[PDB]
């Protein structure tokens, strides 16, 4: 699929799982579904900062259905970025360890 162009709304509070990963549930507000969800993490200065996706491939099947995303964020302070463009969801996260 092509990358989603639309906006995302956070559906639930971001949650830490038992094993140092985060569960992010988002709701899509676009017209181009199905599409792949832009998902990344940055540091404070906007630098791309490494990690891995537990969720296979984040895809919006139905814009009325929220999508779950499990990820292993970098350690310490980062920003989880869902979507792209001016309306990109930018969420602060701290991972202890």
């Amino acid at each position: 699929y092509v990358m989603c162009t639309g906006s995302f709304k956070l559906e639930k509070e971001v949650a830490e799982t038992q094993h140092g990963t985060v569960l992010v549930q988002v709701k899509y507000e676009g017209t181009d579904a199905p599409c792949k969800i832009p998902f990344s993490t940055q540091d404070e200065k906007g630098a791309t900062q490494n990690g891995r996706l537990i969720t296979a491939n984040p895809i919006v099947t139905d814009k009325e259905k929220p999508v779950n995303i499990e990820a292993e964020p970098p350690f310490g302070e980062s920003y989880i970025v869902v979507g792209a463009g001016e309306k990109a969801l930018k969420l602060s996260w701290f991972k202890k360890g």
Partner: antibody
Amino acid sequence: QVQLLQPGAELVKPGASMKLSCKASGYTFTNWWMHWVRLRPGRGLEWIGRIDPNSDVNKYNEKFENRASLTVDKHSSTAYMQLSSLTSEDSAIYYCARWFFPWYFDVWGTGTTVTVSS
Amino acid sequence: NIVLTQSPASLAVSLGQRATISCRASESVDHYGNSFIYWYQQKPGQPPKLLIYLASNLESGVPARFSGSGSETDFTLTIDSVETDDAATYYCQQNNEDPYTFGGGTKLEIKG
């Protein structure tokens, strides 16, 4: 329609300092990061740094860090890039570019042809 | 720094024929399953213009003849049928890690 306007040319002496302007229009200036990139003849494109005009957070290419300064003026929606201790190696076309977060550069400035000469 | 090497330095393609430009990275530009790499087009007297993002996605307004592919360290830009206005220099760029780096540029000419 988005426009990033820069002066066409600057002529500065070696060792001197320069301050380049990028005047944004057509959008909410503080909603997008601004990057700076230069093009040298036969040497390609080089990334200088980025700044968030909203919060003044920034990051430099280490090659330019001791020598460069990124600033904005929210009031006039203008971003500035200052580079000092200029040599002939800094003669280039300097572009400011808007960040399509967190990926590519969607809008490029008009460009400022900079000549470092005695 | 991630080094991006483009090939060839320049090339000429007969009008209507296929063109291919490659970009090779000194290490991975993948971030959460996406390639943080971009292709820009620049013509003389003009600032660059984005064509392809995340290796394979077409920017709106860009003709369908443009396509890109690859992952990790090997990427290609393809124009399956060149036209006159496709003559330009093409640059790949990564932002998978600071500082952002650009490829050396590939200059495409058109015959006919």
